[PDB]
C-alpha cells in the first residue's frame with residue numbers, strides 16, 4: 001500500500017514528514033524544498049504513478065486532493081491566495097512517480113508558471 | 115448558466131474560443147495568451163468562482179477537469195508531459211473568477227512554477 005517511491009515510504013510512515021492533514025484517501029505535508037513561504041503537497045494514499053495514468057474512476061479522488069489543498073491553505077492562513085500545480089512527466093518536471101499536488105502561497109506567484 | 119465572466123460568455127458561445135473538447139460538464143479551449151507551445155484551459159460549465167469556493171460535492175467535477183486535461187494533452191501530442199495549474203486569488207495570479215485549469219506543455223517547464 002502506497003507504492004515503491006519516496007511518497008510510498010511517507011504514506012507507510014517509514015519516514016516522517018511534516019503532516020498537516022490525513023484522512024482515509026490522502027495525506028498533506030510540507031515540501032522539503034519549499035519554493036514559497038508556504039509550499040505543501042497533497043498525495044493520494046492510492047498509488048497512481050502520474051496524472052496521465054489516472055482513470056475515470058479516480059476523478060473524485062483527484063478532486064479531493066484540491067479540496068484538501070484548499071482546506072490546508074486556509075488552515076495555514078493563505079488569505080491572499082495560492083497556486084496549485086501537478087507535474088506530469090519529463091516536461092512537467094515530475095521526479096517522483098506518485099501523483100502529487102503542490103500548493104504554493106505566501107508570496108505573489110509569477111507568470112509563466114515555469 | 116456559465117456565470118458573468120469572460121468564461122461565461124465562452125460557455126454560452128456568445129464568443130467563440132478555440133474549443134478542443136466539450137462534454138456536459140466542461141469545456142477545453144486554447145489559451146489566447148499561450149505561455150508554452152501548447153497551452154489550453156479546462157473549465158467547468160458550472161460557475162464556481164475560485165477553487166477556494168468549491169464545495170465537497172464538487173470533487174468529482176474538479177477531478178473531471180484533470181482527466182479531460184490528460185485526454186486533451188494526449189490528443190495534442192504531449193508525449194513528454196505537461197504541467198497543470200490552478201490559480202487562486204491575488205497571490206495565485208487569478209484574473210478571471212471562474213475556475214480554470216491551465217495545461218501547459220511542448221517545452222520543458224521550469225521550477226519554481228512562478
Ligand SMILES: Nc1ncnc2c1ncn2[C@@H]1O[C@H](CO)[C@@H](O)[C@H]1O
Pocket residue numbers: 006017029030031032033034094095096100
Ligand atoms: N521526504 C520528502 N518530504 C517532503 N517533500 C519531499 C520529500 N522528497 C521529495 N520531496 C518533494 O517532492 C516534490 C516532488 O515533486 C519536490 O517538490 C520535493 O522537494
Ligand SMILES: Nc1ncnc2c1ncn2[C@@H]1O[C@H](CO)[C@@H](O)[C@H]1O
Pocket residue numbers: 120131143144145146147148208209210214
Ligand atoms: N477569450 C479568451 N479565450 C481564451 N483564453 C482567454 C480569454 N480571455 C482570457 N483568457 C486566458 O484566460 C486565462 C485566465 O487565467 C489567461 O491565461 C488568459 O490569457
